[PDB]
Amino acid sequence: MEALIPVINKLQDVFNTVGADIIQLPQIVVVGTQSSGKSSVLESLVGRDLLPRGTGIVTRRPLILQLVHVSQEGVEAEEWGKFLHTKNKLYTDFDEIRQEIENETERISGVSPEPIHLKIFSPNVVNLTLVDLPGMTKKDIELQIRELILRFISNPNSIILAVTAANTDMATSEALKISREVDPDGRRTLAVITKLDLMDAGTDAMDVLMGRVIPVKLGIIGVVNRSQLDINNKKSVTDSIRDEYAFLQKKYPSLANRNGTKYLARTLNRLLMHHIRDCLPELKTRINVLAAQYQSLLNSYGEPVDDKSATLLQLITKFATEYCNTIEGCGGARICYIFHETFGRTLESVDPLGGLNTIDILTAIRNATAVPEVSFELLVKRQIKRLEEPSLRCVELVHEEMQRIIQHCSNYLRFPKLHDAIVEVVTCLLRKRLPVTNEMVHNLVAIELAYINTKHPDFADARDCEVIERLIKSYFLIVRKNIQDSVPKAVMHFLVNHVKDTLQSELVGQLYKSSLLDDLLTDMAQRRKEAADMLKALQGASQIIAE
Amino acid sequence: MEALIPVINKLQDVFNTVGADIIQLPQIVVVGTQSSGKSSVLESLVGRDLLPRGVTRRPLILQLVHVSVEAEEWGKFLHTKNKLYTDFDEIRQEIENETERIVSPEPIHLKIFSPNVVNLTLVDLPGMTKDIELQIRELILRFISNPNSIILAVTAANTDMATSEALKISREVDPDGRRTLAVITKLDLMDAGTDAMDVLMVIPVKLGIIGVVNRSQLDKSVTDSIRDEYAFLQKKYPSLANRNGTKYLARTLNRLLMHHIRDCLPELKTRINVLAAQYQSLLNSYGEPVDDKSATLLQLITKFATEYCNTIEGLCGGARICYIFHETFGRTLESVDPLGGLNTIDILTAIRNATAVPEVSFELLVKRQIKRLEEPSLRCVELVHEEMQRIIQHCSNYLLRFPKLHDAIVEVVTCLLRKRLPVTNEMVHNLVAIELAYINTKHPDFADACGLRDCEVIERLIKSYFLIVRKNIQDSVPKAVMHFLVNHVKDTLQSELVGQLYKSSLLDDLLTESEDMAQRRKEAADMLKALQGASQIIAE
C-alpha cells in the first residue's frame, strides 16, 4: 500500500496543465474559514512554517501539498522541496518556498482554479497529500471562493477535511455548512477541532469530540497549534507540537490518544491510503472509457494535416462524390420533383387556346384568302410560342436546386479559404453552363415553330372557324407533350450531367496548384489542441496505474 | 405609176447593210457569160462607158434615174453617201476600188442621173466562164432563186444559145422561161447556122427576146454606137428594127419592171409587216436593253431568290423534301428494329454487373439502343441538302445569258448551304443525345406501349421505351432541319445573295454578256430597224 499514495500524486501532477475536474480523482480537500487556523494545521503536519501568513494579502489559489517521507538513504540536506510549475528546481531554503507560494498567487493579474503542486521531502513527515483551499469569511469574492470550494468538494471521491476552531460553536460552522451541501449525511467528511485549550461549556463542540452528537461519520480529531503570540515569537512548530502533547496529557487525559498533531497525521495517512485502494478499481475503468471518448473526438477532428499537397487531394475529391451522389440520389429528387411535379403542372395548365380570340382566327382567314390550313399554321405557330418561358423557367429552377445542393454538403469542411474557394468554383461552373442549356431549350421550342407537320401519327383531319379551332387545340396538345418531355431531358444533358462529369476534375484542376496550397490549408484548431492535450494526459495516466 | 420604181430603190438601199435576201424584192438580175458582152449592154443603157473593162466579185445594183451641180449627167454611190460624182472616169474607178477592197454577196448601189436614160434598175452579177466560178454560179443562184426576181439572160448570137450557160442556170431555178427575159447581143455576127435568128423571130423563155448590137473590142462613143446600131437594123433585118435595138430594150425593161412591181407590191407590203412583227418578238426573246446596270443586278438576282423560296416550299423541291421527310427518313427509322443486335446474353451480362433492381440494367441497355437512331437522322439532313443544292440547277434550267454572273450566283448559294450544315447537324446530334441523358419512365405513352423471368420483362421495357423515343426523333429531326437549314436559307438568300453580289466593283464583270450571244441580238436589232424603216417607205 506504500505504492498507492505516490501513484495518486503522480496522477495529479499529469493532470494539472490540463484540468483534473473531468476525472473524479481520489484526494482530500481541506475546507475552513480563515479564522479557523487551517494554515497552522497544515504547517503542523509538515513541521515547519512554509505557508505565507504575510501581512499584505490573502492567497487566491488551491495549494496541493504533497508530503513525502524520505528515509532512509558535500552533504545532503535533510529537508527539501520542488514545485510542479518550476520544473526541476530543488529548494533547500524554506523561506523561498513560502515566497514562491505567495508569488504564484500574486502572479495572476479574484480567485483562480489553477492548483499549485508543492512537494516537500522530509524524514519528519508521514506520506500524505492534501489540497488546501482559500478560506471563507462567514460578498463579491467570498462567493467566488465558495463556488470554487464546491467545484472541488462536489467530487464523489473527495474526502472532506473540515477545520473548525473550538473557540466558536461548531454546529453553526460555515465550513460544516458547505460540506453539508454536497455531503448531507456527512458520510465523507472528517472534522478537525483546533484551539482545544479554548474549550468550555461554554459552547460545543466539546460534546462532539466525546461523540454526542456526531455530524460526520469519519469522526473528529482535536489539535492545538500555535496562535499569533506565539506566532510573534518564533515558537518553532517542533516546540509547539511537543507543547501540545503535554497539554493533552494533563487537560483531557482520557482523550490524549485520539487527539494531537502526530495522531492526526497518522489517521489522515491511513485514511487517505484506505480511501484510494477502495476507489482505485473504479478509477482504472473510469480513465479508460474517458480515454476512448477523447480518442474518438481526436479521430473525428483530426485532420492530422499530414502533408499539405496530399490533404487537398482527399478533402476535395470527397466533395466531388458528396455531389455526383446527391444530384443522382433535396437529392436528386427535388430535381425529378421539379421536373415531374412542377414544370408539368405549369405546362399542362397552359391553355391550347388562351389569348386566341375568335376574331383573331377570322383575321388569319381573311389574309389567307388575300385554304384553312394556311390560317392554321400561323394560328398554332403563336400558340406553340407560349411554351418557351416555362421551359426556360424550368432550367432556372434546376440551377436553383443545384446551387443549393452545395450548401447541403457544406452542412454535411473547416477551411474558410478552401471551402469558400470550392463553392465559388462550383457556383460559377453552373453559370458557365446556364447559357448553353438555355439555348438548346430555346431551339426545342423554336424547332416546332419551324415545320408543324400534319403527317404526325396523332393527327386528325381536315362551320369554318369551328374546325380550325379544333385543329389548333389538337396539334398544340401533341407539341406540348413533346416539349414537356424534351426540356427536362435537355437540362439533364447540358447542365446536370455535364456538371457531374466536369466537377470531378475541374475542381482538382483549378484548386490543385501548389502555389495556392498554403492558402487553402489554413481558428478552431484549439478545440483539437484541447483534445490532443487531454488525450495525451489520459494515455500517460493509464500507463501509470499499471504496475 | 412613175413612183413605183423609185420606192423599190429606196427599198433596196434600206437593206444593203443588213442581208436583203430575207425580203425577196421585185427586181431584175442580169445573168451572162463574160463573153456575152453584158458590160456593153449595161453601158449602152446608161449611154456612157462607166463599167470597168481593164473581174468584178460583187453584184452591182445599177439604178438609172431620168432627170429631164451643174452637170447634166451625174452619179452617187450608196457607200460614199451623198457625194455626187460628175466624172464618170471616177465612177468606173470607184467600182474597181469597192471590188478590190473586200467573191462577196454584198451589193454595191450606184445611182446615175441622166436625161438620156429611162427610169430603170438592174442588178448586175459576176459572169461565168463556161471553183472560183462556182462560188459565183452559187452567188447567181442566191439572187435568181428569188421568186419576184425577173432574170435578164444575155447570150451572144455568136454562140449557140440553147447550150447557154446563162439559159441553163436560169432553167435550174425557173424550169420554163416563165420569168426570164432573153437578150441577144452581137447581132452583126449572126448567121443562119445558129439557134439565134430563129428565136428572135422556138420560144425558150416566156418574157420573150430582144436583139441588140453593142460596141465590141477595139472600139467609139456609146451614143454613136446606138445610132450606128439603128442604121444596121434599118438595112439588115428591116422587118425587125421595131422589135430590137438599145432604145427598144430600155423601153421594154422599164415597162416590164414597172408592171411587175405594182403586181407584186400588195404581197410585199403584207410580207414586210409579218417579218417586222416576227423579228420584234425575236428581239424581245433576247430582250435586254441593259440601260441601268445596277437595276439588272437588283432584278436578275431578286428573281432568282423568288425562283427559290417558292420551289422549296411549293420539279419540286416543295414535296420532294417532304417526301424525303415523311417517306424515306420514315421508312428507315420505322424499320430500325428494337432489340436489334441486343441478344439475350448481353442483357444477362448487363444484369450481372448491374448486380454488385432491374431498372439500372434497363437504362444501360436502352441508352445503347437510342444511340442507333442518330446516323439515319444525320443522313436525313444531308438528303435535304442533296435536294436543295440541286434545286439551284432547277432554276438554272428554268434567263441567262449572263454566264459570269449566273455561275457566281450558284457558288454564292451552293456555299451558303455549306455554312448551315454544321449548325443543323450539331442540333441533330443533340436531339438524339438528349434522349440518352434522362430516359424518363413517367412518360404518358409508356404505360400503354409497355405491353401492360428477369430478362423477360427488361426486353419488353426496352422495346416499349425505344418505340416512343423513335416516334420522337422521326418527327423532331425534320423539324430540326426545317429550322436551321431549309427555313433559315429561305429568309437568308434574299439578301446575303444581294449583299455579296451587289457591288459596283463586280458590275462590269458579272453583267458582261457572252460575245457569241451578244452579236445575234445586234444582227436582229438592226434587221428589225430596217424592216420598220422599209414599212414607212411603203406607207405611201
Side-chain angles (χ1 to χ4, degrees), chain B residues 132-158:
Chain B
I132 298 57
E133 138 158 55
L134 173 114
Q135 275 183 65
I136 291 165
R137 167 195 179 264
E138 185 275 340
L139 180 71
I140 290 171
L141 290 179
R142 181 186 279 97
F143 283 82
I144 84 172
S145 281
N146 186 89
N148 299 98
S149 69
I150 298 171
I151 306 173
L152 188 65
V154 187
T155 307
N158 203 338

PDB file of all heavy atoms in Angstrom, chain B residues 132-158:
ATOM      1  N   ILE B 132     -13.739  28.895-158.394  1.00  0.00           N
ATOM      2  CA  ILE B 132     -13.957  30.297-158.059  1.00  0.00           C
ATOM      3  C   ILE B 132     -15.293  30.629-158.742  1.00  0.00           C
ATOM      4  O   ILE B 132     -16.167  31.296-158.197  1.00  0.00           O
ATOM      5  CB  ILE B 132     -12.810  31.267-158.503  1.00  0.00           C
ATOM      6  CG1 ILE B 132     -11.434  30.978-157.841  1.00  0.00           C
ATOM      7  CG2 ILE B 132     -13.188  32.711-158.250  1.00  0.00           C
ATOM      8  CD1 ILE B 132     -10.834  29.611-157.999  1.00  0.00           C
ATOM      9  N   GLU B 133     -15.375  30.128-159.966  1.00  0.00           N
ATOM     10  CA  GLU B 133     -16.504  30.239-160.880  1.00  0.00           C
ATOM     11  C   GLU B 133     -17.793  29.719-160.212  1.00  0.00           C
ATOM     12  O   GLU B 133     -18.869  30.276-160.395  1.00  0.00           O
ATOM     13  CB  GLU B 133     -16.234  29.465-162.166  1.00  0.00           C
ATOM     14  CG  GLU B 133     -17.423  28.688-162.674  1.00  0.00           C
ATOM     15  CD  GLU B 133     -17.320  28.398-164.147  1.00  0.00           C
ATOM     16  OE1 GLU B 133     -16.315  27.817-164.577  1.00  0.00           O
ATOM     17  OE2 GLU B 133     -18.266  28.770-164.881  1.00  0.00           O
ATOM     18  N   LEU B 134     -17.650  28.655-159.422  1.00  0.00           N
ATOM     19  CA  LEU B 134     -18.778  28.003-158.754  1.00  0.00           C
ATOM     20  C   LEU B 134     -19.298  28.857-157.602  1.00  0.00           C
ATOM     21  O   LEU B 134     -20.500  28.858-157.338  1.00  0.00           O
ATOM     22  CB  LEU B 134     -18.391  26.604-158.261  1.00  0.00           C
ATOM     23  CG  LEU B 134     -19.402  25.856-157.388  1.00  0.00           C
ATOM     24  CD1 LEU B 134     -19.937  24.625-158.101  1.00  0.00           C
ATOM     25  CD2 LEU B 134     -18.777  25.468-156.056  1.00  0.00           C
ATOM     26  N   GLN B 135     -18.414  29.569-156.915  1.00  0.00           N
ATOM     27  CA  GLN B 135     -18.838  30.466-155.847  1.00  0.00           C
ATOM     28  C   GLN B 135     -19.765  31.479-156.525  1.00  0.00           C
ATOM     29  O   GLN B 135     -20.834  31.805-156.006  1.00  0.00           O
ATOM     30  CB  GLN B 135     -17.649  31.175-155.209  1.00  0.00           C
ATOM     31  CG  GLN B 135     -16.951  30.388-154.115  1.00  0.00           C
ATOM     32  CD  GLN B 135     -15.828  31.177-153.473  1.00  0.00           C
ATOM     33  OE1 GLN B 135     -16.061  32.201-152.833  1.00  0.00           O
ATOM     34  NE2 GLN B 135     -14.598  30.704-153.646  1.00  0.00           N
ATOM     35  N   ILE B 136     -19.341  31.971-157.687  1.00  0.00           N
ATOM     36  CA  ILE B 136     -20.115  32.928-158.476  1.00  0.00           C
ATOM     37  C   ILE B 136     -21.440  32.315-158.938  1.00  0.00           C
ATOM     38  O   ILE B 136     -22.493  32.935-158.786  1.00  0.00           O
ATOM     39  CB  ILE B 136     -19.332  33.367-159.725  1.00  0.00           C
ATOM     40  CG1 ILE B 136     -18.137  34.233-159.331  1.00  0.00           C
ATOM     41  CG2 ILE B 136     -20.235  34.131-160.684  1.00  0.00           C
ATOM     42  CD1 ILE B 136     -17.118  34.398-160.436  1.00  0.00           C
ATOM     43  N   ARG B 137     -21.385  31.126-159.535  1.00  0.00           N
ATOM     44  CA  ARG B 137     -22.590  30.451-160.017  1.00  0.00           C
ATOM     45  C   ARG B 137     -23.527  30.305-158.814  1.00  0.00           C
ATOM     46  O   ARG B 137     -24.735  30.511-158.925  1.00  0.00           O
ATOM     47  CB  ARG B 137     -22.261  29.083-160.627  1.00  0.00           C
ATOM     48  CG  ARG B 137     -23.454  28.163-160.875  1.00  0.00           C
ATOM     49  CD  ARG B 137     -23.002  26.729-161.135  1.00  0.00           C
ATOM     50  NE  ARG B 137     -24.124  25.815-161.344  1.00  0.00           N
ATOM     51  CZ  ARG B 137     -24.661  25.046-160.402  1.00  0.00           C
ATOM     52  NH1 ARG B 137     -24.181  25.069-159.167  1.00  0.00           N
ATOM     53  NH2 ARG B 137     -25.674  24.244-160.701  1.00  0.00           N
ATOM     54  N   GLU B 138     -22.952  29.939-157.671  1.00  0.00           N
ATOM     55  CA  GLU B 138     -23.692  29.765-156.421  1.00  0.00           C
ATOM     56  C   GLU B 138     -24.310  31.108-156.022  1.00  0.00           C
ATOM     57  O   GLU B 138     -25.441  31.174-155.538  1.00  0.00           O
ATOM     58  CB  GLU B 138     -22.794  29.215-155.308  1.00  0.00           C
ATOM     59  CG  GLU B 138     -23.513  28.892-154.003  1.00  0.00           C
ATOM     60  CD  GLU B 138     -23.666  30.100-153.097  1.00  0.00           C
ATOM     61  OE1 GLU B 138     -22.918  31.083-153.282  1.00  0.00           O
ATOM     62  OE2 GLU B 138     -24.533  30.065-152.198  1.00  0.00           O
ATOM     63  N   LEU B 139     -23.540  32.173-156.234  1.00  0.00           N
ATOM     64  CA  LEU B 139     -23.956  33.545-155.948  1.00  0.00           C
ATOM     65  C   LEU B 139     -25.107  33.970-156.842  1.00  0.00           C
ATOM     66  O   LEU B 139     -26.068  34.582-156.373  1.00  0.00           O
ATOM     67  CB  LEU B 139     -22.789  34.516-156.138  1.00  0.00           C
ATOM     68  CG  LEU B 139     -23.112  35.986-155.852  1.00  0.00           C
ATOM     69  CD1 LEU B 139     -23.320  36.224-154.368  1.00  0.00           C
ATOM     70  CD2 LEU B 139     -22.039  36.907-156.413  1.00  0.00           C
ATOM     71  N   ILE B 140     -24.994  33.667-158.130  1.00  0.00           N
ATOM     72  CA  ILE B 140     -26.052  33.974-159.080  1.00  0.00           C
ATOM     73  C   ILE B 140     -27.338  33.321-158.591  1.00  0.00           C
ATOM     74  O   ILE B 140     -28.409  33.928-158.633  1.00  0.00           O
ATOM     75  CB  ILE B 140     -25.709  33.482-160.503  1.00  0.00           C
ATOM     76  CG1 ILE B 140     -24.584  34.325-161.107  1.00  0.00           C
ATOM     77  CG2 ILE B 140     -26.939  33.507-161.401  1.00  0.00           C
ATOM     78  CD1 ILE B 140     -24.039  33.770-162.405  1.00  0.00           C
ATOM     79  N   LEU B 141     -27.228  32.084-158.119  1.00  0.00           N
ATOM     80  CA  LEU B 141     -28.397  31.353-157.654  1.00  0.00           C
ATOM     81  C   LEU B 141     -29.067  31.991-156.437  1.00  0.00           C
ATOM     82  O   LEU B 141     -30.285  31.949-156.317  1.00  0.00           O
ATOM     83  CB  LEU B 141     -28.042  29.897-157.347  1.00  0.00           C
ATOM     84  CG  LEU B 141     -27.716  29.015-158.548  1.00  0.00           C
ATOM     85  CD1 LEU B 141     -27.351  27.605-158.104  1.00  0.00           C
ATOM     86  CD2 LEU B 141     -28.889  29.006-159.492  1.00  0.00           C
ATOM     87  N   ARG B 142     -28.276  32.587-155.546  1.00  0.00           N
ATOM     88  CA  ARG B 142     -28.816  33.245-154.353  1.00  0.00           C
ATOM     89  C   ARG B 142     -29.789  34.359-154.725  1.00  0.00           C
ATOM     90  O   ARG B 142     -30.804  34.571-154.059  1.00  0.00           O
ATOM     91  CB  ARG B 142     -27.673  33.826-153.518  1.00  0.00           C
ATOM     92  CG  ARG B 142     -28.136  34.520-152.245  1.00  0.00           C
ATOM     93  CD  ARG B 142     -26.989  35.211-151.522  1.00  0.00           C
ATOM     94  NE  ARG B 142     -26.199  34.280-150.719  1.00  0.00           N
ATOM     95  CZ  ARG B 142     -25.063  33.719-151.120  1.00  0.00           C
ATOM     96  NH1 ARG B 142     -24.573  33.991-152.321  1.00  0.00           N
ATOM     97  NH2 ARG B 142     -24.415  32.884-150.319  1.00  0.00           N
ATOM     98  N   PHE B 143     -29.465  35.060-155.804  1.00  0.00           N
ATOM     99  CA  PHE B 143     -30.283  36.148-156.322  1.00  0.00           C
ATOM    100  C   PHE B 143     -31.434  35.615-157.163  1.00  0.00           C
ATOM    101  O   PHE B 143     -32.576  35.973-156.926  1.00  0.00           O
ATOM    102  CB  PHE B 143     -29.452  37.131-157.145  1.00  0.00           C
ATOM    103  CG  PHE B 143     -28.623  38.060-156.299  1.00  0.00           C
ATOM    104  CD1 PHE B 143     -27.404  37.656-155.784  1.00  0.00           C
ATOM    105  CD2 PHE B 143     -29.087  39.330-155.990  1.00  0.00           C
ATOM    106  CE1 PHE B 143     -26.651  38.509-154.995  1.00  0.00           C
ATOM    107  CE2 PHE B 143     -28.340  40.186-155.203  1.00  0.00           C
ATOM    108  CZ  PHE B 143     -27.122  39.775-154.704  1.00  0.00           C
ATOM    109  N   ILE B 144     -31.148  34.789-158.163  1.00  0.00           N
ATOM    110  CA  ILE B 144     -32.196  34.361-159.089  1.00  0.00           C
ATOM    111  C   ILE B 144     -33.139  33.293-158.516  1.00  0.00           C
ATOM    112  O   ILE B 144     -34.132  32.933-159.148  1.00  0.00           O
ATOM    113  CB  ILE B 144     -31.655  33.933-160.471  1.00  0.00           C
ATOM    114  CG1 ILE B 144     -31.193  32.477-160.438  1.00  0.00           C
ATOM    115  CG2 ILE B 144     -30.528  34.853-160.914  1.00  0.00           C
ATOM    116  CD1 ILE B 144     -30.828  31.927-161.798  1.00  0.00           C
ATOM    117  N   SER B 145     -32.834  32.804-157.316  1.00  0.00           N
ATOM    118  CA  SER B 145     -33.737  31.902-156.598  1.00  0.00           C
ATOM    119  C   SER B 145     -34.901  32.708-156.045  1.00  0.00           C
ATOM    120  O   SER B 145     -35.879  32.155-155.537  1.00  0.00           O
ATOM    121  CB  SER B 145     -33.030  31.172-155.457  1.00  0.00           C
ATOM    122  OG  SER B 145     -32.263  30.084-155.940  1.00  0.00           O
ATOM    123  N   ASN B 146     -34.770  34.024-156.143  1.00  0.00           N
ATOM    124  CA  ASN B 146     -35.772  34.955-155.662  1.00  0.00           C
ATOM    125  C   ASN B 146     -37.036  34.816-156.501  1.00  0.00           C
ATOM    126  O   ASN B 146     -36.984  34.938-157.726  1.00  0.00           O
ATOM    127  CB  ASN B 146     -35.207  36.371-155.759  1.00  0.00           C
ATOM    128  CG  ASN B 146     -36.091  37.407-155.150  1.00  0.00           C
ATOM    129  OD1 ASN B 146     -35.978  37.679-153.971  1.00  0.00           O
ATOM    130  ND2 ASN B 146     -36.975  37.996-155.943  1.00  0.00           N
ATOM    131  N   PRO B 147     -38.178  34.554-155.848  1.00  0.00           N
ATOM    132  CA  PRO B 147     -39.443  34.367-156.567  1.00  0.00           C
ATOM    133  C   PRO B 147     -39.873  35.580-157.389  1.00  0.00           C
ATOM    134  O   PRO B 147     -40.391  35.428-158.496  1.00  0.00           O
ATOM    135  CB  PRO B 147     -40.447  34.073-155.448  1.00  0.00           C
ATOM    136  CG  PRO B 147     -39.616  33.521-154.337  1.00  0.00           C
ATOM    137  CD  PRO B 147     -38.311  34.261-154.412  1.00  0.00           C
ATOM    138  N   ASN B 148     -39.649  36.770-156.844  1.00  0.00           N
ATOM    139  CA  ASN B 148     -40.038  38.013-157.504  1.00  0.00           C
ATOM    140  C   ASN B 148     -38.959  38.591-158.423  1.00  0.00           C
ATOM    141  O   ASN B 148     -39.090  39.707-158.925  1.00  0.00           O
ATOM    142  CB  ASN B 148     -40.463  39.047-156.460  1.00  0.00           C
ATOM    143  CG  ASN B 148     -41.655  38.587-155.641  1.00  0.00           C
ATOM    144  OD1 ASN B 148     -41.499  38.089-154.525  1.00  0.00           O
ATOM    145  ND2 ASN B 148     -42.853  38.741-156.193  1.00  0.00           N
ATOM    146  N   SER B 149     -37.895  37.822-158.635  1.00  0.00           N
ATOM    147  CA  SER B 149     -36.755  38.255-159.437  1.00  0.00           C
ATOM    148  C   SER B 149     -36.884  37.859-160.896  1.00  0.00           C
ATOM    149  O   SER B 149     -36.911  36.673-161.227  1.00  0.00           O
ATOM    150  CB  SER B 149     -35.476  37.633-158.887  1.00  0.00           C
ATOM    151  OG  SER B 149     -35.457  36.232-159.103  1.00  0.00           O
ATOM    152  N   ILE B 150     -36.964  38.854-161.769  1.00  0.00           N
ATOM    153  CA  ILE B 150     -37.011  38.587-163.191  1.00  0.00           C
ATOM    154  C   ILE B 150     -35.560  38.391-163.611  1.00  0.00           C
ATOM    155  O   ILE B 150     -34.665  39.069-163.109  1.00  0.00           O
ATOM    156  CB  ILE B 150     -37.563  39.802-163.955  1.00  0.00           C
ATOM    157  CG1 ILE B 150     -39.000  40.085-163.511  1.00  0.00           C
ATOM    158  CG2 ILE B 150     -37.484  39.591-165.459  1.00  0.00           C
ATOM    159  CD1 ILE B 150     -39.561  41.379-164.041  1.00  0.00           C
ATOM    160  N   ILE B 151     -35.328  37.464-164.535  1.00  0.00           N
ATOM    161  CA  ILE B 151     -33.975  37.141-164.968  1.00  0.00           C
ATOM    162  C   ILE B 151     -33.713  37.652-166.375  1.00  0.00           C
ATOM    163  O   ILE B 151     -34.409  37.287-167.321  1.00  0.00           O
ATOM    164  CB  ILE B 151     -33.756  35.619-164.930  1.00  0.00           C
ATOM    165  CG1 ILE B 151     -34.104  35.068-163.546  1.00  0.00           C
ATOM    166  CG2 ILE B 151     -32.317  35.280-165.289  1.00  0.00           C
ATOM    167  CD1 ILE B 151     -34.083  33.558-163.467  1.00  0.00           C
ATOM    168  N   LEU B 152     -32.700  38.501-166.507  1.00  0.00           N
ATOM    169  CA  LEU B 152     -32.310  39.011-167.808  1.00  0.00           C
ATOM    170  C   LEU B 152     -31.124  38.179-168.277  1.00  0.00           C
ATOM    171  O   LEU B 152     -29.984  38.428-167.889  1.00  0.00           O
ATOM    172  CB  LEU B 152     -31.874  40.466-167.668  1.00  0.00           C
ATOM    173  CG  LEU B 152     -31.608  41.201-168.980  1.00  0.00           C
ATOM    174  CD1 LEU B 152     -32.909  41.314-169.751  1.00  0.00           C
ATOM    175  CD2 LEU B 152     -31.008  42.574-168.731  1.00  0.00           C
ATOM    176  N   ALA B 153     -31.406  37.186-169.116  1.00  0.00           N
ATOM    177  CA  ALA B 153     -30.389  36.260-169.594  1.00  0.00           C
ATOM    178  C   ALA B 153     -29.793  36.776-170.895  1.00  0.00           C
ATOM    179  O   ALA B 153     -30.479  36.866-171.912  1.00  0.00           O
ATOM    180  CB  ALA B 153     -31.016  34.898-169.825  1.00  0.00           C
ATOM    181  N   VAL B 154     -28.510  37.114-170.857  1.00  0.00           N
ATOM    182  CA  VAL B 154     -27.838  37.692-172.012  1.00  0.00           C
ATOM    183  C   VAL B 154     -26.967  36.642-172.692  1.00  0.00           C
ATOM    184  O   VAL B 154     -26.126  36.009-172.052  1.00  0.00           O
ATOM    185  CB  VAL B 154     -26.953  38.876-171.590  1.00  0.00           C
ATOM    186  CG1 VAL B 154     -26.399  39.584-172.813  1.00  0.00           C
ATOM    187  CG2 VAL B 154     -27.745  39.847-170.733  1.00  0.00           C
ATOM    188  N   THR B 155     -27.173  36.459-173.992  1.00  0.00           N
ATOM    189  CA  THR B 155     -26.402  35.495-174.763  1.00  0.00           C
ATOM    190  C   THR B 155     -25.984  36.124-176.088  1.00  0.00           C
ATOM    191  O   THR B 155     -26.738  36.888-176.686  1.00  0.00           O
ATOM    192  CB  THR B 155     -27.273  34.266-175.084  1.00  0.00           C
ATOM    193  OG1 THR B 155     -27.844  33.754-173.873  1.00  0.00           O
ATOM    194  CG2 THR B 155     -26.449  33.175-175.755  1.00  0.00           C
ATOM    195  N   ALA B 156     -24.778  35.801-176.541  1.00  0.00           N
ATOM    196  CA  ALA B 156     -24.263  36.323-177.797  1.00  0.00           C
ATOM    197  C   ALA B 156     -24.821  35.463-178.922  1.00  0.00           C
ATOM    198  O   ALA B 156     -24.936  34.245-178.784  1.00  0.00           O
ATOM    199  CB  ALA B 156     -22.759  36.193-177.719  1.00  0.00           C
ATOM    200  N   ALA B 157     -25.172  36.102-180.036  1.00  0.00           N
ATOM    201  CA  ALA B 157     -25.651  35.381-181.211  1.00  0.00           C
ATOM    202  C   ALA B 157     -24.499  34.573-181.787  1.00  0.00           C
ATOM    203  O   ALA B 157     -24.704  33.599-182.512  1.00  0.00           O
ATOM    204  CB  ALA B 157     -26.189  36.347-182.251  1.00  0.00           C
ATOM    205  N   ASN B 158     -23.285  35.013-181.463  1.00  0.00           N
ATOM    206  CA  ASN B 158     -22.054  34.357-181.881  1.00  0.00           C
ATOM    207  C   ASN B 158     -22.064  32.859-181.580  1.00  0.00           C
ATOM    208  O   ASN B 158     -21.646  32.048-182.406  1.00  0.00           O
ATOM    209  CB  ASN B 158     -20.850  35.027-181.208  1.00  0.00           C
ATOM    210  CG  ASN B 158     -19.557  34.817-181.970  1.00  0.00           C
ATOM    211  OD1 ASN B 158     -19.429  33.879-182.756  1.00  0.00           O
ATOM    212  ND2 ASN B 158     -18.586  35.695-181.739  1.00  0.00           N
TER     213      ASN B 158
END
